[PDB]
Design a protein around this ligand. Sequence first.
Ligand SMILES: [Ca+2]
Ligand SMILES: [Ca+2]
Ligand SMILES: [Cl-]
Ligand SMILES: [Cl-]
Length: 192
Amino acid sequence: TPDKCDPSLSLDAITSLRGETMIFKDRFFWRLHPQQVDAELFLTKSFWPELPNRIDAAYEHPSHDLIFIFRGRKFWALNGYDILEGYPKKISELGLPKEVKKISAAVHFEDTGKTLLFSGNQVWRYDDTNHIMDKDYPRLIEEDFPGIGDKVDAVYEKNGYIYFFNGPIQFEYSIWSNRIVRVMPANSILWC
Ligand SMILES: [Ca+2]
Ligand SMILES: [Ca+2]
Ligand SMILES: [Cl-]
Ligand SMILES: [Cl-]
């Protein structure tokens, strides 16, 4: 059982599901609402047993209302409690190289059709408009987003900002000014 305010909390992944935020930790996930209080914790397998027990990264696709879940080399598309047919797919149909096995985080920006997947120390920018990898990548975490470290454990965009969680730390980054607006404890996403 994950501790909501263990000031040593790191997160495994983070999406948004129809304007409801989902934070994954181990075989759990916290569900958050647009308000101020409350933060439920369910088992992941309560909702989707076909999934793995650990989640590597997660992102929501706004035009399809889908959530892609990454674990090792396989990824799952999910809509509701369902799992789209044809899944789990490999991360190969994704165009990622093969010296790449894990995906640590993922964010999709509705502004550009660009899906930002991070692996180990690099990034990769897919084009979820044309299904293509923006060729000027794999850039280094350090090169593109300087300041946040050299690894991303979870990431999400709540309007304007891209939130990077590096270990027990949260960065409120500005995609437009390329500068860390503010730094916080990872668990404040859960009000702690
Ligand atoms: Ca992760
Ligand atoms: Ca994400
Ligand atoms: Cl996301
Ligand atoms: Cl993520």
